[PDB]
C-alpha cells in the first residue's frame with residue numbers, strides 16, 4: 001500500500017523533507033523533478049538527513065560529520081558512514097507524493 005506522504009511543492013528540486021509513518025522516519029528528496037525516498041537516519045550517527053542536510057545533485061550530505069549518500073541507491077559516497085540507506089518505493093500522482101512505507105529495501 002502506497003501512502004500519501006506529502007505534496008510535490010513541499011519538496012522543490014534540491015530540497016529534502018522528512019515524513020513519518022508508523023514508527024518510521026523517511027527522507028524525501030527531489031532531484032531535478034525526480035523523487036527519491038530513503039531512511040531519514042544517517043548510518044554514521046543517526047542524524048536526520050533532512051535536517052540541515054545539503055543536497056548536491058543526487059548526493060545528500062549529512063550536516064553532522066559530512067557523510068554523503070547517493071539518494072538513488074542509498075549507496076555511501078563519503079565516510080564516516082559505512083552502511084547504505086534503506087530505500088523505499090515512491091510514486092507521484094498529480095501533486096501527491098506516495099511512498100510504500102512497508103517496502104524498505106537495502107543494498108549489500
Ligand code: FES
Pocket residue numbers: 042043044045046047062063064065066067079080081
Ligand atoms: S551523523 Fe551523519 S555523518 Fe555523522
